[PDB]
């Protein structure tokens, strides 16, 4: 994980890699926070009665 | 006809996206995914050839 060249070396399992193009490391924007939603469900049970 | 539409498919998130534990259990299957990506990239080079 030091640089993308080491990522290519580590995924082709060699220490020398010949000239070209390689496909590695699909990435993602890494979601940051939580949220929960439920309706405006205020119709309460009569605990006071 | 001459060429067809090149395509590429991730093994990992297509099988299971976002679940790290599912990737952990998938890594217990070896290197199927690398073979599949190799086959697709072979096709991808072959179209331009």
- Rounded to whole angstroms, what are the CA distances from A43 to A36, A38, A40, A46, A49? 20, 14, 9, 10, 15
Resolution of this entry, Å = 3.9
Tell me if B10 and A23 make a contact (CB, 8 A cut-off). Answer: no
Cα(B46)–Cα(B49) distance, integer angstroms? 5
Tell me if A23 and B8 make a contact (CB, 8 A cut-off). Answer: yes
Provide the total of helices (H) and of strands (E) in chain A, helices listed first. Answer: 1, 0
């Amino acid at each position: 994980a030091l640089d993308p060249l080491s990522e290519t070396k580590c995924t082709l399992k060699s220490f020398t890699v010949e000239k070209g193009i390689y496909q590695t490391s699909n990435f993602r924007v890494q979601p940051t926070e939580s949220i929960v939603r439920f309706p405006n469900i205020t119709n309460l049970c009569p605990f006071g009665e | 006809p001459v060429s067809m539409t090149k395509t590429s498919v991730d093994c990992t998130m297509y099988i299971c996206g976002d679940s790290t534990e599912c990737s952990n259990l998938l890594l217990q299957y070896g290197s199927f995914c690398t073979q599949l990506n190799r086959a697709l990239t072979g096709i991808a080079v072959e179209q331009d050839k």
